[PDB]
């Protein structure tokens, strides 16, 4: 039922972090050229990430997925995307049952189906040691570190690795924060790897946290799952919120659970099917 | 109804969701907004709806909705995309035909599979036709100190919609959003004026950025390109056939004589076919 010259796809999003999902089983990977075209919001389809679904690699998983950014390069992990792959897998008959595993580029992740739209994904175990983030110029683990980013920009932040590095800055109001400017400053500070994602968090209660994230490469999007998990863990590590907490992002709301310091952070949230598509003249770019 | 077939197209990066409305209701404001949402919907500058023709001449009409669900009286790049759509659907057979827009009837020449020349409108420079306020009896280059401290020298023309055309030394560094909004709020024009920032490279070539009503800048504004060309032709600065380079692509503009329609040649592209799932 696949017309030659065309590429079927599914447009999805997880809390406004949006994806072009391809079924890559028994065929090639998309070239970088094709990924770039797919992600072009005006002349292509438009998305934060291209996700390609294949047969499982691990013994237990029901499907595997790979990830491409809007410039065509591969990416090692994605938070919101995993929920969309899970929903897509359920819809395609790949994944039956309340619980199943998915292979990402970097690991195998257990998924719980909470309802048709809601999926819970184990992401990673937070690492706080300055040595594992790495947090340069710091040796003792601390709840908060302090950065002099030049006169007029003094920043107090927490630090944690979720596979990717994260700086978490508490704010009076997130809608409000110099996300792009301070996020770029922290990224260029040399306190972290240049890949650090900078979150700006406002604690509404022990149950509810508001967050914006300046992400490496993309900059800010509507939702950064890794950053949400990082903000939650940091605020839990310092006793500010409960071990189950809602994180409110521009594009949607997630529920983060971290039952034990040695356990994986769990990320619950929505997955949405937006439209089905057929990209024309897929060989002509 | 349940799901909704659509076609995604663009004209020089000005992008559209095209619906076939020939026997169904118009998209609601709510549907238009969901359709235009780039992250949680389809994503487009405008929604276009194909309808049966109104004029004796045309093979099809089309209506236009903005990303907030309100209707729009015309669109230059969209017309080329409607032309391509109409050819593909078998509505228009040979290399020329007419299309009804919400505000007129437009001759289309099919130059090749992806290239269409469309007659936009006859330029009107009379201050009372723009309408120009405060002036409204004066036809020349104008100068005005806007309410935001900027002094601007600009030409005025109506292509159906109003246009202010400002010459600059460099389109890349021009204050398109700031001065474009200043001009719209000025009261020299209806708030609906599109504000162009044009650098003349040669008599054959013009670079342009346009601050549009409502949307702000996009990758291409066809009516703005026609307005900038007609202004610079009346000002004697360019030939009656001129290329207008926009952020998303290039258009070829011709205005054979002062009573003629301005003709706008440029690309139209099909990107993908889609089924919107509502749910």
Coordinates of C-alpha atoms in Angstrom, one line a residue:
Chain A
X1 CA 0.0 0.0 0.0
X2 CA 3.1 2.2 -0.3
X3 CA 3.1 4.3 -3.5
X4 CA 6.5 4.3 -5.2
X5 CA 8.1 7.8 -5.1
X6 CA 6.4 8.6 -1.8
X7 CA 7.4 8.3 1.9
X8 CA 4.6 7.6 4.4
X9 CA 5.0 9.3 7.8
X10 CA 3.1 10.1 11.0
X11 CA 3.2 13.6 12.6
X12 CA 3.2 13.4 16.4
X13 CA 4.1 15.5 19.4
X14 CA 4.8 15.0 23.0
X15 CA 3.7 18.1 24.9
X16 CA 4.5 20.2 21.8
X17 CA 7.9 18.7 21.2
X18 CA 7.0 17.4 17.7
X19 CA 8.2 14.5 15.5
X20 CA 8.1 13.1 12.0
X21 CA 7.8 9.3 12.6
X22 CA 8.9 7.0 9.8
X23 CA 8.5 3.2 9.7
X24 CA 12.0 2.2 8.6
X25 CA 11.5 -1.6 8.9
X26 CA 13.1 -3.5 5.9
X27 CA 14.4 -0.4 4.3
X28 CA 17.2 2.2 4.3
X29 CA 17.7 5.0 6.8
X30 CA 16.7 8.5 5.7
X31 CA 19.7 10.5 4.4
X32 CA 20.7 13.7 6.1
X33 CA 19.3 15.5 3.0
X34 CA 15.9 13.9 3.5
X35 CA 15.9 14.5 7.3
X36 CA 16.7 18.2 6.6
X37 CA 13.8 18.4 4.2
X38 CA 11.4 16.6 6.5
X39 CA 12.2 19.0 9.4
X40 CA 11.9 22.2 7.3
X41 CA 8.7 23.7 8.7
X42 CA 8.0 25.9 5.6
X43 CA 9.3 23.8 2.7
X44 CA 9.1 20.4 4.3
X45 CA 7.0 18.7 7.0
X46 CA 8.4 20.4 10.1
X47 CA 9.5 18.9 13.3
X48 CA 12.0 19.0 16.2
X49 CA 13.2 15.4 15.5
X50 CA 12.8 12.7 12.9
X51 CA 12.2 9.3 14.6
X52 CA 12.8 6.1 12.6
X53 CA 11.2 2.9 14.0
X54 CA 12.8 -0.6 13.4
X55 CA 12.7 -4.1 14.8
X56 CA 13.9 -4.5 18.4
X57 CA 17.6 -4.9 18.9
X58 CA 17.5 -6.2 22.6
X59 CA 16.1 -9.5 23.6
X60 CA 13.2 -7.9 25.5
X61 CA 12.2 -4.8 23.5
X62 CA 9.3 -4.7 21.0
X63 CA 10.8 -2.0 18.8
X64 CA 13.9 0.1 18.3
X65 CA 14.1 3.7 17.2
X66 CA 16.8 6.1 15.9
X67 CA 16.8 9.9 16.1
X68 CA 17.8 12.7 13.6
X69 CA 17.9 16.4 14.4
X70 CA 16.7 19.1 12.0
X71 CA 20.2 19.3 10.4
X72 CA 20.3 15.6 9.6
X73 CA 22.7 14.4 12.2
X74 CA 22.0 11.5 14.5
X75 CA 21.1 12.1 18.2
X76 CA 21.7 9.8 21.1
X77 CA 18.6 10.2 23.2
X78 CA 15.2 11.9 23.4
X79 CA 12.7 12.2 26.2
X80 CA 9.4 13.1 24.6
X81 CA 10.1 11.2 21.5
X82 CA 10.1 7.9 23.4
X83 CA 6.5 8.3 24.4
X84 CA 5.5 8.9 20.8
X85 CA 7.3 5.9 19.6
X86 CA 5.5 3.9 22.3
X87 CA 2.1 5.2 21.2
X88 CA 3.0 4.6 17.6
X89 CA 4.2 1.0 18.4
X90 CA 0.9 0.3 20.2
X91 CA -1.1 1.6 17.2
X92 CA 0.9 -0.5 14.8
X93 CA 0.4 -3.8 16.8
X94 CA 4.1 -3.9 17.7
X95 CA 3.4 -3.4 21.4
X96 CA 0.6 -5.2 23.2
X97 CA 0.1 -5.1 26.9
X98 CA 0.4 -2.4 29.7
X99 CA 4.2 -2.7 29.8
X100 CA 6.9 -3.1 27.2
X101 CA 10.5 -2.0 26.3
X102 CA 11.9 0.2 23.6
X103 CA 15.5 0.3 22.3
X104 CA 16.7 3.9 21.9
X105 CA 20.1 4.8 20.4
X106 CA 21.7 4.6 23.9
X107 CA 19.7 2.1 26.0
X108 CA 16.6 0.1 26.6
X109 CA 13.7 1.8 28.4
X110 CA 10.6 0.3 30.0
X111 CA 7.3 1.8 29.1
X112 CA 4.0 1.6 31.1
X113 CA 0.8 2.4 29.2
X114 CA -1.3 4.4 31.6
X115 CA -4.1 5.0 29.1
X116 CA -4.4 5.3 25.3
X117 CA -2.7 8.8 25.4
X118 CA -0.4 8.5 28.5
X119 CA 2.9 6.7 28.7
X120 CA 5.5 6.4 31.5
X121 CA 9.1 6.0 30.5
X122 CA 12.2 5.2 32.6
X123 CA 14.8 7.6 31.5
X124 CA 18.1 7.4 33.5
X125 CA 19.5 7.5 37.0
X126 CA 20.6 11.0 37.9
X127 CA 24.3 11.6 38.5
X128 CA 25.2 14.5 40.9
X129 CA 28.9 14.0 41.4
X130 CA 30.9 17.0 39.9
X131 CA 33.2 14.3 38.5
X132 CA 30.4 12.6 36.4
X133 CA 28.6 15.6 35.0
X134 CA 31.5 16.9 34.7
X135 CA 31.2 20.2 36.5
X136 CA 34.5 21.9 36.0
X137 CA 36.1 23.9 38.7
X138 CA 34.1 22.1 41.4
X139 CA 35.1 19.0 43.4
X140 CA 32.7 18.6 46.3
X141 CA 29.1 17.8 45.4
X142 CA 26.9 20.7 46.4
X143 CA 23.1 21.4 46.3
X144 CA 23.9 24.8 44.6
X145 CA 27.0 26.1 42.9
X146 CA 27.7 29.8 42.1
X147 CA 28.9 31.2 38.8
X148 CA 30.3 34.6 38.1
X149 CA 29.4 35.2 34.4
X150 CA 30.8 38.7 34.3
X151 CA 29.6 41.8 36.1
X152 CA 25.8 41.8 36.2
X153 CA 25.3 38.0 35.7
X154 CA 25.7 36.1 38.9
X155 CA 24.0 32.7 38.7
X156 CA 23.2 30.1 41.4
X157 CA 22.5 26.7 39.9
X158 CA 22.3 23.0 40.6
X159 CA 23.9 20.5 38.4
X160 CA 23.1 16.9 37.3
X161 CA 23.6 14.5 34.5
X162 CA 20.7 12.5 33.0
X163 CA 22.9 11.1 30.2
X164 CA 23.1 14.7 29.1
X165 CA 24.4 17.5 31.4
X166 CA 21.9 19.9 33.1
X167 CA 22.1 23.1 35.0
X168 CA 19.0 24.0 36.9
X169 CA 18.4 27.7 38.0
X170 CA 15.5 28.5 40.3
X171 CA 13.6 31.6 39.3
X172 CA 10.8 33.9 40.5
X173 CA 8.9 33.4 37.3
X174 CA 9.8 31.2 34.3
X175 CA 7.7 33.0 31.6
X176 CA 10.0 35.7 32.7
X177 CA 13.6 34.4 32.7
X178 CA 16.4 35.4 30.4
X179 CA 16.3 31.8 29.1
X180 CA 18.2 32.3 25.8
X181 CA 20.7 34.8 27.2
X182 CA 21.6 33.2 30.5
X183 CA 21.3 29.8 28.9
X184 CA 23.9 30.8 26.3
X185 CA 26.1 32.3 29.0
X186 CA 26.0 29.1 31.0
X187 CA 26.7 27.0 27.9
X188 CA 29.8 29.2 27.1
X189 CA 30.9 29.5 30.8
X190 CA 33.1 26.4 30.6
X191 CA 31.6 25.2 33.9
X192 CA 29.9 22.3 32.0
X193 CA 30.4 20.5 28.7
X194 CA 29.2 22.8 25.9
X195 CA 26.3 20.4 25.6
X196 CA 24.7 21.5 28.9
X197 CA 20.9 22.2 28.9
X198 CA 20.0 25.1 31.0
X199 CA 16.6 25.0 32.9
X200 CA 14.9 27.8 34.6
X201 CA 12.6 26.5 37.3
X202 CA 9.9 28.0 39.4
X203 CA 8.5 26.0 42.4
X204 CA 4.8 26.6 42.7
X205 CA 4.4 23.9 45.4
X206 CA 5.9 20.6 46.5
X207 CA 3.7 19.1 43.9
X208 CA 4.2 21.4 40.9
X209 CA 7.1 23.1 39.1
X210 CA 7.2 25.4 36.1
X211 CA 10.1 25.1 33.7
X212 CA 11.6 26.4 30.6
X213 CA 14.8 24.9 29.2
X214 CA 17.5 26.4 26.9
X215 CA 18.6 23.2 25.1
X216 CA 21.9 22.5 23.5
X217 CA 21.7 22.9 19.7
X218 CA 18.0 23.5 19.3
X219 CA 17.7 26.2 21.9
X220 CA 14.3 26.4 23.6
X221 CA 11.5 24.1 22.5
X222 CA 7.9 23.7 23.8
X223 CA 9.1 20.7 26.1
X224 CA 12.4 19.2 27.1
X225 CA 11.8 15.9 28.9
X226 CA 15.4 15.3 30.0
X227 CA 15.4 18.8 31.4
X228 CA 12.1 18.3 33.3
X229 CA 13.6 15.1 34.9
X230 CA 16.7 17.0 35.7
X231 CA 14.8 19.9 37.4
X232 CA 12.7 17.4 39.4
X233 CA 15.6 15.4 40.6
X234 CA 17.6 18.5 41.6
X235 CA 14.6 19.9 43.6
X236 CA 14.0 16.5 45.2
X237 CA 17.7 16.2 46.1
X238 CA 17.5 19.5 48.0
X239 CA 14.1 18.7 49.6
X240 CA 12.1 21.3 47.8
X241 CA 9.4 19.0 46.2
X242 CA 7.9 15.6 46.7
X243 CA 9.2 12.5 44.9
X244 CA 6.3 12.7 42.5
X245 CA 5.9 16.2 40.9
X246 CA 4.3 17.8 37.9
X247 CA 6.6 19.8 35.6
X248 CA 4.7 22.4 33.6
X249 CA 6.4 23.3 30.3
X250 CA 5.3 25.8 27.6
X251 CA 3.8 23.0 25.5
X252 CA 2.4 20.7 28.1
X253 CA 2.6 19.1 31.5
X254 CA 4.7 16.1 32.6
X255 CA 4.6 14.0 35.8
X256 CA 8.0 13.0 37.2
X257 CA 8.5 10.2 39.7
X258 CA 11.9 9.3 41.3
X259 CA 11.1 6.8 44.0
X260 CA 14.7 6.2 45.2
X261 CA 18.0 7.9 44.7
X262 CA 19.4 4.7 43.1
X263 CA 16.5 4.3 40.8
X264 CA 15.7 5.6 37.3
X265 CA 13.7 8.8 37.0
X266 CA 10.2 8.0 35.5
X267 CA 8.6 10.5 33.1
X268 CA 4.9 10.3 32.5
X269 CA 3.2 12.4 29.8
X270 CA 1.0 12.7 26.7
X271 CA 1.7 11.4 23.2
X272 CA -0.4 12.8 20.4
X273 CA -1.2 11.7 16.8
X274 CA -1.6 14.9 14.7
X275 CA -1.9 13.8 11.1
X276 CA -0.8 11.0 8.7
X277 CA 1.2 12.1 5.7
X278 CA 2.8 11.0 2.4
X279 CA 5.9 13.0 1.4
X280 CA 6.0 13.4 -2.3
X281 CA 8.9 12.6 -4.7
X282 CA 11.0 11.3 -1.8
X283 CA 14.0 10.6 -4.0
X284 CA 14.2 14.2 -5.4
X285 CA 15.8 16.5 -2.9
Chain B
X1 CA -16.1 15.4 9.4
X2 CA -13.8 12.9 11.3
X3 CA -10.5 13.0 9.4
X4 CA -9.7 15.8 6.9
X5 CA -7.7 15.3 3.7
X6 CA -5.4 18.2 2.9
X7 CA -2.5 19.2 0.7
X8 CA 0.6 21.0 2.0
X9 CA 2.1 23.4 -0.5
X10 CA 4.4 26.4 -0.5
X11 CA 5.2 29.3 -2.8
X12 CA 8.7 30.4 -2.3
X13 CA 8.5 29.3 1.4
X14 CA 5.1 31.0 2.0
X15 CA 3.3 27.9 3.0
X16 CA -0.3 26.7 2.9
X17 CA -2.7 24.0 3.9
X18 CA -5.0 23.5 0.9
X19 CA -8.5 22.1 1.5
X20 CA -11.0 21.0 -1.2
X21 CA -14.2 22.9 -0.1
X22 CA -16.2 22.3 -3.2
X23 CA -18.9 20.4 -1.3
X24 CA -18.3 21.0 2.4
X25 CA -18.5 23.8 4.9
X26 CA -15.7 26.3 5.5
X27 CA -13.1 25.5 8.1
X28 CA -14.0 27.0 11.5
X29 CA -11.8 29.6 13.1
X30 CA -10.9 26.8 15.6
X31 CA -10.0 24.4 12.9
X32 CA -7.9 27.0 11.0
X33 CA -6.0 27.7 14.2
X34 CA -5.3 24.0 14.9
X35 CA -4.3 23.5 11.2
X36 CA -1.9 26.5 11.3
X37 CA -0.2 25.4 14.6
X38 CA 3.3 24.3 13.6
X39 CA 4.0 22.1 16.6
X40 CA 0.6 20.7 17.5
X41 CA -1.1 21.0 14.1
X42 CA 0.0 21.0 10.5
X43 CA 1.7 24.4 10.3
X44 CA 1.2 27.0 7.6
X45 CA 1.0 30.7 6.9
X46 CA -2.5 30.4 5.4
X47 CA -5.3 27.9 4.9
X48 CA -6.7 27.9 1.3
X49 CA -10.0 26.5 0.3
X50 CA -10.8 25.5 -3.2
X51 CA -14.3 26.2 -4.5
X52 CA -16.3 26.2 -7.7
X53 CA -15.6 29.4 -9.8
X54 CA -17.7 32.5 -9.5
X55 CA -16.8 34.5 -12.6
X56 CA -17.8 33.3 -16.1
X57 CA -14.1 33.0 -17.0
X58 CA -12.5 31.1 -14.0
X59 CA -12.1 27.4 -13.6
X60 CA -11.9 27.6 -9.8
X61 CA -12.2 30.0 -6.9
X62 CA -10.3 29.9 -3.6
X63 CA -10.9 31.5 -0.2
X64 CA -8.2 32.4 2.4
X65 CA -7.9 32.1 6.1
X66 CA -5.1 33.3 8.4
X67 CA -3.6 31.4 11.2
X68 CA -6.1 33.0 13.6
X69 CA -9.1 31.8 11.6
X70 CA -10.2 35.1 10.0
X71 CA -10.6 35.4 6.3
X72 CA -8.2 37.3 4.0
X73 CA -8.9 39.2 0.9
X74 CA -5.9 38.1 -1.2
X75 CA -2.6 36.3 -1.4
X76 CA 0.0 36.4 -4.2
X77 CA 1.9 33.2 -3.5
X78 CA -1.2 31.3 -2.6
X79 CA -2.7 31.9 -6.1
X80 CA 0.2 30.1 -7.7
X81 CA -0.3 27.2 -5.4
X82 CA -4.0 27.1 -6.2
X83 CA -3.1 27.2 -9.9
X84 CA -0.9 24.1 -9.5
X85 CA -3.5 22.4 -7.4
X86 CA -6.1 23.1 -10.1
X87 CA -4.0 21.7 -12.9
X88 CA -3.3 18.6 -10.9
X89 CA -7.0 18.1 -10.1
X90 CA -7.9 18.4 -13.9
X91 CA -9.8 21.7 -13.3
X92 CA -7.5 23.6 -15.6
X93 CA -6.5 21.9 -18.9
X94 CA -4.2 24.0 -21.0
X95 CA -1.4 26.5 -20.3
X96 CA -3.8 29.4 -19.3
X97 CA -6.9 29.9 -17.3
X98 CA -8.5 32.1 -14.7
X99 CA -8.9 31.8 -10.9
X100 CA -11.2 33.7 -8.6
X101 CA -9.6 34.9 -5.4
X102 CA -11.8 36.5 -2.7
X103 CA -11.2 39.9 -4.3
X104 CA -10.7 39.4 -8.0
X105 CA -10.2 37.2 -11.1
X106 CA -6.6 36.4 -12.1
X107 CA -5.2 35.2 -15.4
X108 CA -2.7 32.3 -15.0
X109 CA -0.1 31.2 -17.5
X110 CA 1.5 27.8 -16.8
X111 CA 5.1 28.3 -17.8
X112 CA 6.2 24.8 -16.7
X113 CA 5.2 22.1 -14.2
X114 CA 6.3 24.2 -11.2
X115 CA 6.2 27.8 -12.5
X116 CA 3.1 30.0 -12.9
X117 CA 2.6 33.6 -14.0
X118 CA -0.5 35.2 -12.3
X119 CA -2.1 38.6 -12.9
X120 CA -2.4 40.2 -9.4
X121 CA -4.0 43.6 -9.8
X122 CA -3.7 47.0 -11.5
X123 CA -1.6 49.2 -9.2
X124 CA -3.3 52.3 -7.8
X125 CA -1.1 55.2 -6.6
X126 CA -3.8 57.8 -6.0
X127 CA -3.7 58.7 -2.2
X128 CA -7.4 58.3 -2.1
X129 CA -7.2 54.8 -3.5
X130 CA -4.6 53.6 -0.9
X131 CA -6.2 55.3 1.2
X132 CA -3.4 57.6 2.4
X133 CA -4.4 59.8 5.4
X134 CA -3.0 63.2 6.1
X135 CA -1.8 63.1 2.6
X136 CA -4.8 61.9 0.6
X137 CA -4.2 64.5 -2.1
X138 CA -0.6 64.1 -3.2
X139 CA 1.3 61.6 -5.4
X140 CA 5.1 61.5 -4.9
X141 CA 7.5 59.9 -2.6
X142 CA 6.4 60.7 0.9
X143 CA 8.3 61.5 4.1
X144 CA 7.0 61.2 7.6
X145 CA 8.1 61.2 11.2
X146 CA 6.4 58.3 12.8
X147 CA 5.2 58.1 16.4
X148 CA 8.2 56.0 17.4
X149 CA 10.9 58.5 16.5
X150 CA 11.8 57.0 13.1
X151 CA 11.8 59.2 10.0
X152 CA 10.8 57.4 6.9
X153 CA 10.8 58.1 3.1
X154 CA 8.2 55.8 1.5
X155 CA 6.1 55.3 -1.6
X156 CA 2.4 54.2 -1.4
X157 CA 0.4 51.9 -3.7
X158 CA -2.7 49.7 -3.6
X159 CA -2.5 46.2 -5.0
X160 CA -5.9 45.4 -3.6
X161 CA -4.2 45.6 -0.1
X162 CA -2.2 48.7 0.9
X163 CA 1.6 48.8 0.6
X164 CA 4.3 51.2 1.8
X165 CA 7.6 50.7 0.0
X166 CA 10.8 51.9 1.6
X167 CA 14.1 51.9 -0.1
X168 CA 17.1 50.8 2.0
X169 CA 20.8 50.2 1.5
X170 CA 20.7 46.7 2.9
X171 CA 17.6 44.5 3.4
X172 CA 19.5 42.2 5.8
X173 CA 19.9 44.9 8.5
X174 CA 16.7 46.8 7.9
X175 CA 14.3 47.4 10.8
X176 CA 11.5 45.4 9.2
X177 CA 9.5 44.5 12.3
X178 CA 10.1 47.8 14.2
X179 CA 9.4 50.2 11.3
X180 CA 6.8 47.9 9.7
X181 CA 4.8 48.1 12.9
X182 CA 5.4 51.8 13.3
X183 CA 4.0 52.4 9.8
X184 CA 1.0 50.2 10.4
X185 CA 0.2 52.1 13.7
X186 CA 1.0 55.5 12.1
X187 CA -2.5 56.4 10.9
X188 CA -1.0 57.3 7.5
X189 CA -2.6 54.0 6.3
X190 CA -5.2 51.5 7.3
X191 CA -3.6 49.2 9.9
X192 CA -3.6 46.6 7.1
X193 CA -0.8 48.1 5.1
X194 CA 2.1 45.8 4.2
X195 CA 5.5 47.5 4.6
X196 CA 8.3 46.6 2.2
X197 CA 12.0 47.2 2.6
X198 CA 13.7 47.1 -0.8
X199 CA 17.2 47.4 -2.1
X200 CA 17.7 48.0 -5.8
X201 CA 20.7 45.9 -7.0
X202 CA 20.2 46.8 -10.7
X203 CA 17.4 47.8 -13.1
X204 CA 16.8 44.0 -13.4
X205 CA 17.1 43.0 -9.7
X206 CA 15.6 44.0 -6.4
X207 CA 16.0 42.5 -2.9
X208 CA 13.0 42.8 -0.6
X209 CA 11.7 42.0 2.9
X210 CA 8.1 42.7 3.8
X211 CA 6.4 43.3 7.1
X212 CA 2.9 41.9 6.5
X213 CA -0.4 42.7 8.2
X214 CA -1.0 40.3 11.0
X215 CA 1.7 37.7 10.2
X216 CA 4.7 40.0 10.3
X217 CA 7.5 38.9 8.1
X218 CA 7.3 35.5 6.3
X219 CA 9.6 33.9 3.7
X220 CA 7.7 35.5 0.8
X221 CA 5.0 38.1 0.2
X222 CA 4.0 38.1 -3.5
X223 CA 1.7 41.2 -3.3
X224 CA 4.5 43.0 -1.6
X225 CA 6.9 42.0 -4.4
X226 CA 4.4 43.4 -7.0
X227 CA 4.0 46.6 -5.0
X228 CA 7.7 47.2 -4.6
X229 CA 8.2 46.5 -8.4
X230 CA 5.4 48.8 -9.4
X231 CA 6.6 51.6 -7.2
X232 CA 10.2 51.4 -8.4
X233 CA 8.9 51.2 -12.0
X234 CA 6.8 54.4 -11.5
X235 CA 9.9 56.0 -9.8
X236 CA 11.9 55.1 -12.9
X237 CA 14.4 53.0 -10.9
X238 CA 13.9 49.6 -12.6
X239 CA 12.7 48.1 -15.8
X240 CA 9.2 46.9 -16.5
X241 CA 10.5 43.3 -16.1
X242 CA 12.3 42.9 -12.8
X243 CA 13.4 40.1 -10.4
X244 CA 12.4 40.5 -6.8
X245 CA 14.5 38.4 -4.4
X246 CA 12.7 37.4 -1.2
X247 CA 14.0 35.3 1.8
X248 CA 12.4 32.1 0.6
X249 CA 12.9 32.5 -3.2
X250 CA 12.8 34.7 -6.2
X251 CA 9.9 36.1 -8.2
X252 CA 9.8 37.7 -11.7
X253 CA 7.5 40.7 -12.0
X254 CA 6.3 42.4 -15.1
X255 CA 4.1 45.4 -15.5
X256 CA 3.7 46.1 -19.3
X257 CA 1.9 49.4 -19.0
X258 CA 0.3 51.6 -16.4
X259 CA -3.2 50.2 -17.0
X260 CA -2.0 46.6 -17.1
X261 CA -2.2 44.1 -14.2
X262 CA 1.1 43.5 -12.5
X263 CA 2.1 39.9 -13.5
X264 CA 3.9 37.8 -10.9
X265 CA 5.9 34.8 -12.0
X266 CA 7.2 32.3 -9.4
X267 CA 7.3 28.8 -8.1
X268 CA 4.5 26.6 -6.6
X269 CA 5.4 23.3 -4.9
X270 CA 3.5 20.3 -3.5
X271 CA 5.2 19.1 -0.4
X272 CA 3.1 16.3 1.0
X273 CA -0.5 15.0 1.2
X274 CA -2.0 14.6 4.6
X275 CA -5.0 13.3 6.6
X276 CA -5.6 15.5 9.7
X277 CA -6.9 13.2 12.5
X278 CA -8.7 15.9 14.6
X279 CA -8.5 13.6 17.6

